[PDB]
Design an enzyme around this catalytic site. Structure first.
Site, PDB file in Angstrom:
ATOM      1  N   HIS A   1       0.841  -1.193   0.000  1.00 59.85           N
ATOM      2  CA  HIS A   1       0.000   0.000   0.000  1.00 59.85           C
ATOM      3  C   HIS A   1       0.880   1.247   0.000  1.00 59.85           C
ATOM      4  O   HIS A   1       0.593   2.217  -0.709  1.00 59.85           O
ATOM      5  CB  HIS A   1      -0.950   0.003   1.200  1.00 59.85           C
ATOM      6  CG  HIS A   1      -1.752   1.259   1.335  1.00 59.85           C
ATOM      7  ND1 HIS A   1      -3.006   1.405   0.779  1.00 59.85           N
ATOM      8  CD2 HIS A   1      -1.480   2.429   1.960  1.00 59.85           C
ATOM      9  CE1 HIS A   1      -3.471   2.610   1.058  1.00 59.85           C
ATOM     10  NE2 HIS A   1      -2.565   3.252   1.772  1.00 59.85           N
ATOM     11  N   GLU A   2       1.952   1.202   0.789  1.00 59.17           N
ATOM     12  CA  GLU A   2       2.908   2.299   0.874  1.00 59.17           C
ATOM     13  C   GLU A   2       3.792   2.364  -0.366  1.00 59.17           C
ATOM     14  O   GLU A   2       4.264   3.445  -0.740  1.00 59.17           O
ATOM     15  CB  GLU A   2       3.785   2.177   2.123  1.00 59.17           C
ATOM     16  CG  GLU A   2       3.035   2.103   3.454  1.00 59.17           C
ATOM     17  CD  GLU A   2       2.029   3.229   3.657  1.00 59.17           C
ATOM     18  OE1 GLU A   2       2.316   4.383   3.263  1.00 59.17           O
ATOM     19  OE2 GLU A   2       0.948   2.956   4.227  1.00 59.17           O
TER      20      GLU A   2
ATOM     21  N   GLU B   1      -5.051   8.924  -2.205  1.00 60.22           N
ATOM     22  CA  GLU B   1      -5.276   7.917  -1.172  1.00 60.22           C
ATOM     23  C   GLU B   1      -6.393   6.930  -1.542  1.00 60.22           C
ATOM     24  O   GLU B   1      -6.289   5.734  -1.262  1.00 60.22           O
ATOM     25  CB  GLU B   1      -5.603   8.607   0.157  1.00 60.22           C
ATOM     26  CG  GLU B   1      -5.649   7.674   1.353  1.00 60.22           C
ATOM     27  CD  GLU B   1      -4.328   6.977   1.584  1.00 60.22           C
ATOM     28  OE1 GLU B   1      -3.282   7.663   1.572  1.00 60.22           O
ATOM     29  OE2 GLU B   1      -4.331   5.740   1.773  1.00 60.22           O
TER      30      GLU B   1
END
Ligand code: ZN
Length: 850
Positions: free
Chosen positions: A230-231, A268
């Site tokens: 995800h990062e 995001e």
């Protein structure tokens, strides 16, 4: 080349190659150096706590929090030993090996590695390369015998640190210089990351199928490799300089029950994927696309004008010109002029924003993740040992098929894989709370911020639909799909790097100009005052303190709040009086069998104008429009979905801006094209309007209905916990002889009550999803369509008049175009929810609706 993962121990010596003493961007040239290990090319692990912008006191748990969203766990001792640092390294190595075990993740890594930051900034002139900036160059210290002494610069893409004060708050940071960010402007820059693999988030699946237990809804811990990934998607967006900011989703805070959070960016939500991009309106979708494309136009202009590098004469101009061509996917013509191919750019843009996605990756690696970014997050847990292959593998993570853990993510289930995790002490957990006081006898309840309703403010959504439109002969209309077929991304060759990576060695950094972020804690408690007893009060009235022994059920809410031995129940009168019944030991087994069976019957109550309605919801929560009072079925039968809403939102339905049509005297074709382009632009505005309504529905209404679902799961669990406590107490009251003869199984009671709960949550899920869609289709869509039918008439008048003012320039097809305008504006674009979601459960609710 195929992605290589390096191997090393923390104690391994400095070789000036794969292990160096590095001066990280936020060190600001203050002589601080960190032992950094090159895990892959361009990516470095530093097994050290992330301290930049913090204070030492922050690493301890106090009365404050950093983020209102997060259940924050603190541990200052984490990574205070050489051995602890080695574990960190080995775990990071293992996680990176899990990432590249499947092609999709390998693509993500190769794109990160090869996505080198542009050798420049906005301040850098178009004709120059500059490697003398903090977002491009990082310094290493060379320590050898008396011959050479200096610093030396290396290029890097990603530097991964250990956690900051909050262990489970994984964040990716971009570098800001002079209030601007290169990673938001097409250039890209060195990405930083603070990460902790051992402390992972917990979520639940409260919207699912199956009425049987099979350990449904018991809780699921996250897979550290997915969290890292995800990062890594953030890292990707930052290296390509496409991590832009636009109109964010901002929470409404004008009511006490409303959830409190920082602004949520589209970047995001794209990263998470799934249903979430639909919360970002099509107007904002295009706005982001345009800013990215404009940034890319700047870089392509720079490459055509670049001739010299000012910082280092050893920098080969052609090599980096060939590499940035390969990074941004530009085309070169005969003379050597770089330009943007739209078909290339769109493929690239969609792959980075909609291809590489938490939902797409999880669904490819067979890892369970939360349903939405807006899903409630439970208290984090510690994974005992990630290096233990009997618990966590490179190939299959937690869901190992030898242990029978692969089926339906059993390896992640909290109730099944007990040995994989340790629960965390709440003395070390900081949570943003709301102390709620109701008007001898004054009653106060500490309520989690997470258990509050998320409702997007009006200012979250774009008004671009109200703006006018210039319709010309070359006016092109756009749809940007919040979707990208994942199999196409895995097999695509164009995204794979062709030009080999340049050497990391360069001149030392002398310009240390950098904006370092500053973090401070805010108080973790807020006191509010109110007159209304709603869900938070109704849920609390179903709890009891741990020291109270002889609890009894009551249909009286007031009595439950006042008496600590009284617990509120929303089931029938017969259930309550049966539960409070004291019998002789001989009939106890029969009573336990009866009351447990009654619980299941009471929870499964659903009488049958669409779908099935669960009638005890009003008594359970008192949500929205005073639903505990009177009769819920009757109140619903009159009003419907509205009565359950705690807040009726103000809908944004803009009046669609007028089309301004260009005139083309003595040019028939350009008149016909304009009429056509105006009709295609009409379809765009319809689609956009639908997207604006869906965006508001998901983030203002559907979230309130999600909170009700989570409230009902808690409420039903409270009722089971109350019954279990009563049975347990009544059992222990008997003599030791009596207990022996007439026995029950406490594991049997648990599973039976749990199975009734899952059956009930199914019914509630079906009903509530019905409400949510019903509200969209009855109270939202028609109002948007009504304004689009005004726009159609206005456009009808406009286009017909346009044909008249140009009747002589057509002659051959004036009546043809007039009947063309007439029939195209009778075709109303059908609203299809399948465009925005892929839940299947909500898709069928939409389909059932006539
Ligand atoms: Zn994120």
């Amino acid at each position: 080349m195929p992605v290589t993962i390096n191997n090393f121990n923390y104690n391994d010596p400095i070789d000036n190659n794969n292990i160096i003493m590095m001066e990280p961007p936020f060190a600001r040239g203050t002589g601080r150096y960190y032992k950094a290990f090159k895990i892959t090319d361009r990516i470095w692990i530093i097994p050290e706590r992330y301290t930049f912008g913090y204070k030492p006191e922050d690493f301890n748990k106090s009365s404050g929090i950093f983020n209102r969203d997060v259940c924050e766990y603190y541990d200052p001792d984490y990574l205070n030993t050489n051995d602890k640092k080695n574990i960190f390294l080995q775990t990071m190595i293992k996680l990176f090996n899990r990432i590249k075990s499947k092609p999709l993740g390998e693509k993500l890594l190769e794109m990160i590695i090869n996505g080198i930051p542009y050798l420049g900034d906005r301040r850098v002139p178009l004709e120059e390369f500059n490697t003398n900036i903090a977002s491009v160059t990082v310094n290493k210290l060379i320590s050898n015998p008396g011959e050479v002494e200096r610093k030396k610069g290396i290029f890097a893409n990603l530097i991964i640190f250990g956690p900051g004060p909050v262990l489970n708050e994984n964040e990716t940071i971009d570098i800001g210089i002079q209030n601007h960010f290169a990673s938001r402007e097409g250039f890209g820059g060195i990405m930083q990351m603070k990460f902790c693999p051992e402390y992972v988030s917990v979520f639940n699946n409260v919207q699912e199928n199956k009425g049987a237990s099979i350990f449904n809804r018991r809780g699921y811990f996250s897979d550290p490799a997915l969290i890292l990934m995800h990062e890594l998607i953030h890292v990707l967006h930052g290296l390509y300089g496409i991590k832009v900011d636009d109109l964010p989703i901002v929470p409404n805070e004008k009511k006490f029950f409303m959830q409190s959070t920082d602004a949520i960016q589209a970047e995001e939500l794209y990263t998470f994927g799934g249903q979430d991009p639909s919360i970002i309106t099509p107007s904002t979708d295009k706005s982001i696309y345009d800013k990215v494309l404009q940034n890319f136009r700047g870089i392509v202009d720079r490459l055509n004008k670049v001739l010299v590098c000012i910082s280092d004469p050893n920098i080969n101009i052609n090599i980096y010109k060939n590499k940035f061509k390969d990074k941004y996917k530009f085309v070169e013509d005969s003379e050597g002029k770089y330009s943007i191919d739209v078909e290339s750019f769109d493929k690239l843009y969609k792959s980075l924003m909609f291809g590489f996605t938490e939902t797409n990756i999880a669904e490819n690696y067979k890892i369970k993740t939360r349903a939405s970014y807006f899903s409630d997050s439970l208290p984090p847990v510690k994974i005992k040992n990630l290096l233990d292959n009997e618990i966590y593998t490179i190939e299959e993570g937690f869901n190992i098929s030898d242990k029978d853990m692969e089926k339906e993510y059993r390896g992640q289930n909290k109730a099944i894989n007990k040995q994989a995790y340790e629960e965390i002490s709440k003395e070390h957990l900081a949570v943003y709370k709301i102390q709620m006081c109701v008007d001898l006898v004054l009653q106060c309840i500490d309520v989690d911020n997470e258990d509050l309703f998320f409702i997007a403010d009006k200012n979250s959504f774009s008004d671009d639909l109200s703006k006018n439109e210039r319709i010309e002969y070359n006016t092109q209309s756009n749809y940007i799909e919040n979707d990208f077929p994942i199999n196409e991304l895995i097999l695509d060759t164009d995204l794979i790097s062709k030009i080999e990576l340049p050497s990391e060695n360069t001149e030392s950094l002398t310009d240390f100009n950098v904006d370092v972020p500053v973090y401070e804690k805010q108080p973790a408690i807020k006191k509010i005052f109110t007159d209304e007893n709603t869900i938070f009060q109704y849920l609390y009235s179903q709890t009891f303190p741990l020291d109270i022994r002889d609890i009894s059920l009551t249909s009286s809410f007031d009595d439950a709040l006042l008496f600590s031995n009284k617990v509120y129940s929303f089931f029938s009168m017969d259930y309550i009086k049966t539960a409070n019944k004291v019998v002789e030991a001989g009939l106890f087994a029969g009573w336990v069998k009866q009351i447990v069976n009654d619980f299941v019957i009471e929870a499964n109550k659903s009488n049958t104008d669409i779908s099935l309605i669960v009638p005890y919801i009003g008594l359970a929560l008192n949500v929205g429009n005073e639903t505990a009072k009177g009769n819920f079925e009757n109140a619903f039968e009159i009003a419907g979905a509205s009565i359950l809403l705690e807040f009726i939102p103000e809908l944004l339905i803009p009046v669609v801006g007028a089309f301004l049509l260009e005139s083309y005297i003595d040019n028939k074709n350009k008149i016909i094209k304009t009429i056509d382009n105006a009709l295609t632009k009409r379809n765009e505005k319809w689609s956009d309007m639908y997207g604006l309504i869906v965006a508001q529905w998901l983030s203002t209404v559907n979230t309130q209905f999600y909170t009700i679902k989570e409230g009902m799961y808690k409420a039903l669990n409270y009722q089971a916990q109350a019954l279990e406590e009563i049975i347990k107490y009544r059992y222990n009251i008997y003599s030791e002889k009596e207990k022996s003869n007439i026995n029950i199984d406490f594991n049997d009671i648990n599973s039976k009550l749990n199975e009734g709960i899952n059956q009930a949550i199914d019914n509630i899920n079906n009903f509530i999803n019905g409400c949510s869609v019903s509200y969209l289709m009855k109270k939202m869509i028609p109002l948007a369509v009504e304004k689009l039918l005004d726009f159609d008439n206005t456009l009808k008048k406009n286009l017909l008049n346009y044909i008249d003012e140009n009747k002589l320039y057509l002659i051959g097809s004036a009546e043809y175009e007039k009947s063309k305008v007439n029939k195209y504006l009778k075709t109303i674009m059908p609203f299809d929810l399948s465009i925005y979601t892929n839940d299947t459960i909500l898709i069928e609710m939409f389909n059932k609706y006539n």
